[PDB]
Amino acid sequence: QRLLVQFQDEGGQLLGSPFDVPVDITPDRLQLVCNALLAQEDPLPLAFFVHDAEIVSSLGKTLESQAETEKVLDIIYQPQA
């Protein structure tokens, strides 16, 4: 239902600290949180990935297609247009 997640850039660097999200969270809602953390003057659209699968609909949909023994789930973010 709720999962502890952690943002991570394409270079493997961690962004912020782990936080709880509902499993049904969408990429649009993840973009809002991530750009809040990045605090840029010109933020960019973001794509998100968990275990080498893109979150295109919701975190839960992508996780179902895989699978979870882990305690913190790394969500990789990547700028897109």
CA 73 remoteness from chain centre: 9
Interior angle at CA 48, CA 46 and CA 24, nearest 5: 115
Range of the domain at 15: 1-81
Method of determination?
X-ray
Query: Resolution limit in angstroms?
Result: 1.9
Domains held by the chain: number: 1
Contact present, 65 and 55 (Cβ < 8 Å)? no
φ/ψ (deg, to 5) at 29: -70, -35
At residue 63, φ and ψ (nearest 5 deg) are -70, -35
Instruction: Yes or no: say if 61 and 25 are a contact pair by the CB < 8 Å rule.
Output: no
Q: Cα 55–62–70 angle (5° rounding)? A: 105
